[PDB]
Design a protein around this ligand. Sequence first.
Ligand SMILES: COC(=O)Nc1ccc2c(c1)NC(=O)C[C@@H](C)CCC[C@H](NC(=O)/C=C/c1cc(Cl)ccc1-n1cnnn1)c1nc-2c[nH]1
Length: 238
Amino acid sequence: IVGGTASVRGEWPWQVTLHTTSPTQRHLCGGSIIGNQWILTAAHCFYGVESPKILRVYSGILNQSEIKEDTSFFGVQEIIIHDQYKMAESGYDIALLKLETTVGYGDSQRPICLPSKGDRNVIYTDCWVTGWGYRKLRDKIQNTLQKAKIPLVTNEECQKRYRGHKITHKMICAGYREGGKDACKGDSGGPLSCKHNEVWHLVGITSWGEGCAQRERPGVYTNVVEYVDWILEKTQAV
Ligand SMILES: COC(=O)Nc1ccc2c(c1)NC(=O)C[C@@H](C)CCC[C@H](NC(=O)/C=C/c1cc(Cl)ccc1-n1cnnn1)c1nc-2c[nH]1
């Protein structure tokens, strides 16, 4: 996260850190708890991941230093990538992780509500991007979960900023015209959380941008409301 500040413990209890074990253990991506065995994240996080056996999901983490060999995690039973996904820049950048065991909800780990279809028309004014990603283009994974408040940008304005790309309504953009606050390397897969009527909603999934926090280059997020039926298809299968 560029231009953000330290989160307080329990502030974003749906935020997870997804680690890979191959070749060595490191933070791979962010994710959000959406159900007691479900993590919503970005499809591009699994580039080159040949098996769910190398993945570890840690919930209830503020600091990466809380993670040692003796720290409990959730194993991943299955990786579900949207089958229209080709690359982050073309959209469908969405994946579900089905966990091997159930998350016990509490004040340190709980789900974020998905947006309602009836709320496609609501204007969100209180949106935050979170993660342990870089604070600048060449940096390192941050110990403390960072947060940054960022305004949503219309599809028309985002398309103007990304000449040469096709910004679809399945994407949602966020950023200041002058830049300064954004997601960066290591934040992808994490949430873009917006508070509406005292309820937090998972509005976006951190996906891509041209550099980080650049003037007139908003962050591009998967527009979660456009995938609610796909999430229900995969999580509510009979
Ligand atoms: C010690 O541990 C570490 O250092 N871990 C460690 C360290 C770094 C990374 C990873 C692990 N993850 C990967 O490389 C997985 C691999 C498939 C994922 C590729 C892509 C991923 N992109 C982002 O996270 C965000 C992009 C992004 C999104 C928005 Cl909305 C705006 C600007 C963005 N940027 C444009 N340019 N940079 N950012 C990424 N993540 C990293 C580099 N790049």
